[PDB]
Write a structure and sequence with these properties.
By secondary structure, this protein is mostly helical. The chain is built from five helices and no strands. The PDB classes it as gene regulation.
Length: 121
């Protein structure tokens, strides 16, 4: 139906906007600490600590399959990246600190992304 096509076009346009958001947030991680999944070869106990691992590459796979239906879903995955790191790693570490700086800088980007999503519909 035409209604289904129109809903698909909206999902495509959201995907475009979330790709620009994703690029902008990942620029706030110049060390590439959050670029890839924590390796279970290198951190064998990780899944005993962290129940829902997340990273930018995993989010990009989901995005390219148009797997985010709304901005809330995308933000959920971004907050897991930050929140998982702040639990596993102590305050005194470069990992925790990188997560704090990503959260602080990413908030700015997400604030305007929400206005754009609501504005354009």
């Amino acid at each position: 139906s035409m209604e289904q096509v129109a809903m698909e076009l909206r999902l495509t346009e959201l995907t475009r906007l979330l790709r620009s958001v994703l690029d902008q947030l990942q620029d706030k991680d110049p060390a590439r600490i959050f670029a890839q999944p924590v390796s279970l070869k290198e951190v064998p106990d990780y899944l005993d600590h962290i129940k829902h691992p997340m990273d930018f590459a995993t989010m990009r796979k989901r995005l390219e399959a148009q797997g985010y239906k709304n901005l809330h879903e995308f933000e959920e995955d971004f907050d897991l990246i930050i929140d998982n790191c702040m639990k596993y790693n102590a305050r005194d570490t470069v990992f925790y600190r990188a997560a704090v700086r990503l959260r602080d800088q990413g908030g700015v980007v997400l604030r305007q992304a929400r206005r754009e999503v609501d504005s354009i519909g």
